[PDB]
């Protein structure tokens, strides 16, 4: 009954934001994706963010780059948390992207997380950090990650110790 | 019955936009000035654009500092023209405010002018521009604006050498 | 039962979170709030974050100058989101800040607000969003201080009409 | 009625093809010329001021790096001029726009993004000014931008079915 | 036609930081004109100037502007003479957008850009010295002789900061 | 007496084998391991008091983006720091540079270049803190020094002939 | 005889280098300190490195503004630790001095700290950090500097607790 | 005799000032270039400069990327005109190379210009305008090279008139 709900302003963005997906589907949290820009499709964006909201959405996901609104749009019609990730497309490396999202006025919070796919993946975490607060399920999915990572780390390290 | 409004999102914008007040009542342009935030009134600023816009709006300007989203809010409701000052508040000196105003993805432009008060000023000079395509009288008053700076700098030049 | 706990790297970084401060305790949430640094007092720190992680708290908030390590380091010791807010303070307008606080790799998120006094009151504003999540007294309170700050725009917007 | 499009280097036309083609398509008719503010100053001047009073309605200017374009154009007119900041060099632009966008009160250069969605953005804006007098391109600009909700409504439903 | 440097700005706010040249130039007995001339606001003004200035017998030429600075830009596309260009400091970006508007010249078109602020108006000034003291001994003498001084106000801080030790 | 050099990703192995080939080269003795500030704190910290009480006399740490490696290991110890940020990422590495440099009063690491030359630079700087008590070491950078001299004055006599 | 050599270009960075020499003072290191500019007194501030060098100066220390070439210029002249603290004076905040000492090339390493007092400070505490490799009494001073710094911390925490 | 002296640190920015060399060249002005470090070897570049200053060098040119030190060693050792060109090279995209370049405390000129290739030609053209004062011959070469070009973008833009 709980979801995430994760907005693109354009399709190109998908490349991206298929590290979400993966994330999302390996913690089983169910999730909904759109294509809707705040530029080009204003009227349907809101839309959604509303039925989205009232359907019991959690946590919204937003990606954009350049003048990245999307996110600030969301924040702006509903009262649930926000998470913005910054594209990295364009000649300036997505700074642009990353001021246009972070920099809210006090009154509007957006979560706004790194630039690129590793903060497409830390806004599937995020999200799910913040719905593990209710379920325990997914509280305990996290902790294994962290603990599977580790002996990942582990592993490159004795590695390491050969070629040395 | 043509006339130019003028969007901030902050009753602190007035500071800088007053320059514009003043450049638009120079050249005899009336204008409608309002309190409206994307983020936090964005029905509101909805509404007033599309109802602006129907009753012969020319152009539209909006100001706005940190993550400004107000004038990409008001170009994707509108086709008529839109300017976009970028505020110089904050720590970062508006550079936050000029990148998330200008980098508009391709299909939906915003006209971006300098920094603070060169831009509203500017704005409104844009705007009279604008309208002088087709208003000779408008027109009449920019050119003769013109000769009156130039007038004003030979002023402060023969000042200058006396002071050697 | 549930708290939010605010962690700063010095006494300096008091006079930007004292918003903060104002902002949770307006919306009935209890929080804690402690002197603590990643770089002066790390075992202090982590034991901090781990023991309040038991007690209870929903989210840690960081708020951390120049080098921001802070967020980083509380993340790296939780699986509850951490929340940072990058300082303004140093000749750098707080962009050291802010890219050291929102530059996480992907697996260990923080969500990083806008710099300063704007990020502060963010900070504590998507705390409330994430707690009301499971609480509906404080939902009801987010819903009413954003019709309440509709009403206070509203009126400055109708003071500025008769200043023209 | 027509927009005159100026470039300093033939390098610029990459990305000013763009803005060629949203025009086309609008049916808005425009002049494109090589001319340089640094190289060709006098042949710059002289266009500007030839070309304004043979009823150009916008100028739009693409320069690199240290852009002057604009500003020169603006110095020449008071018919309104779009620049547009160039990609290139090892900044990734920022030169060119902050040299573009950071005009002095007075003398306005309405600035668009920097690269092609600049060039793109700067043909519509040159249309959308050009349509406060004309129904037929008002109704062009909105069916353009109906088409592309049309556009984003199928990558929607291509998603879904992949989803 | 004698030999001097003209200094052009395009504002009356320029002067407190050009005030440093014309006291550099001042110093060292090198002649000079300087105007209010805007690149944006009297371009026609500005290129008779710089014309007019060339064909008198200007050396270099030393040019402020901040923000969007375009002045040494129009200049040196007007005159084949060695320009100059000095970015302001002013405005919310501590003068990086004029460093880089002045400095990013196109090959073929050059302008010598110096330091933001009063540090860059100085150097436009000695620099210029320094231009014209390949054809002028006097001002060579005069230009080392300034560095003997400066080496012996070092020279004398320093022993002062050693009293404080 | 040995270098210790930490890295949070094996992907940061690409630019830390040249401190590797600097330090083999000058017969310094050193351990490299990967740990990460964000995902292994504690073993990071375990390791860092660890190889400080088993005579490690300089830290070199290397990380991009957010960069806490450096800073996590000067917490944990009076060992001198050497941080050198990585040059990956869309900001070229001025994130790391700002995250690793810009250190509160009173707890300093000592930050190098970003990339490779700072790869070289941290391992020729720790090479100079241990030459101070041996000196077979000094006499080894002397001589790096006036070879790289050499290698310079050969260049320039082959430019000379392309001339 | 081991010692620290201090390198200033202007007596405007004295405001700036007072916390090293306070610092050193603290630790009993013995120091010397000159105004010597790489730019206008370039013979001088070669023949004292050399010079120091030879009588058994263990680190040098060197600060400056703007195009920061103090440390590269000592560095090319010994191979004893140099390190670098770029001033913060300028309308650029000290970021032309940052990248000017760090970006040093490959073989000629220059140790670069923080702007402005931060930076000084801990150039005396790294430099202090390379000395008790060698001199236990350092270390053990060095120690119970930051048990010191801790209580201070913990002073402060105590004296926010009251007010909250 | 009146020659430029050309120096540059590394052999990997000969790829950059060879269309210094064609420049030169084709004004028919005699010049000298030399690989010479004022990191790696300081001496000998200081050697260099005040040997060819006695000899006549009427202008410097440096190349240098990263931390360019090498135009500003030159600018100490000699009151002749130094024109500092910065290199391209490293993820910073020459910036570090231009502020360190560009950034002279009063009393040591250099004289900047644009990074890379740009900045390689117009330093032989300045370091031309500069010896064309003092020489007709290379006065009347510069005009002519201006004229040339303008021929060459008028060919481009009627070769863009067949396109259209």
Known sequence: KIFVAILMGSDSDLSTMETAFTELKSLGIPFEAHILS???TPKETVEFVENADNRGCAVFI????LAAHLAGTIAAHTLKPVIGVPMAGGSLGGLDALLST?????????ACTAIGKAGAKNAA???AQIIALQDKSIAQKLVQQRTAKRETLKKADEN???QL
Chains 1, 2, 3, 7, 8 share one sequence.
Do not use: N, W
């Open 160 to 162: 390491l110790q050969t």
């Open 125 to 127: 975490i995020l999200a």
């Open 38 to 40: 705040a530029h080009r």
């Open 102 to 110: 972070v920099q809210m006025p006090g009154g509007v919070p957006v």
């Open 62 to 65: 937003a990606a954009a780059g």
